[PDB]
């Protein structure tokens with residue numbers, strides 16, 4: 182049993198809710214919140230910008246030190262950093278950004294990072310300002326992630342479309 186509430190069950194291991202991931206993280210304090218990161222960990226907008234704003238820019242400060250030491254992530258890759266006031270840990274995962282021309286096949290590699298964590302609160306990778314089709318992202322999630330994932334979808338209209346079209 183865990184503290185996630187109000188989710189619709191899509192599969193054995195994938196759950197979905199119309200929710201602001203910032204507000205959900207603040208209430209649940211999950212072990213892992215996933216950030217929709219880019220390779221530079223520049224958290225300017227979308228989910229990343231919202232998560233970073235909620236940390237009062239501490240996420241960005243930590244991320245800048247990470248990049249200065251380690252260099253950029255790979256598209257499809259991830260790193261574990263602090264969850265600050267939102268979670269124990271933040272798993273920064275880089276899905277391909279279609280608005281930069283990155284290969285959508287890398288979306289499966291991106292979701293594979295979730296399998297290193299037993300339970301996660303996450304957005305749909307490569308959705309929103311990353312330009313992929315969220316219905317496709319949900320399909321890849323369900324077909325790739327085997328650990329327990331709680332998906333937060335900010336837009337109610339999109340949430341309803343994701344549920345109604347789910348196979």
Ligand SMILES: COC(=O)Nc1ccc(C(=O)N[C@@H]2c3ccccc3C[C@@H]2C(=O)O)cc1
Pocket residue numbers: 201202203226227228231304305308309310315333334335336339
């Ligand atoms: C004040 O609080 C906040 O700013 N919160 C906040 C701000 C932005 C986003 C976001 O860009 N989300 C992504 C988004 C947007 C449109 C379509 C698909 C998706 C996938 C992501 C999701 O559905 O979560 C999420 C939360």
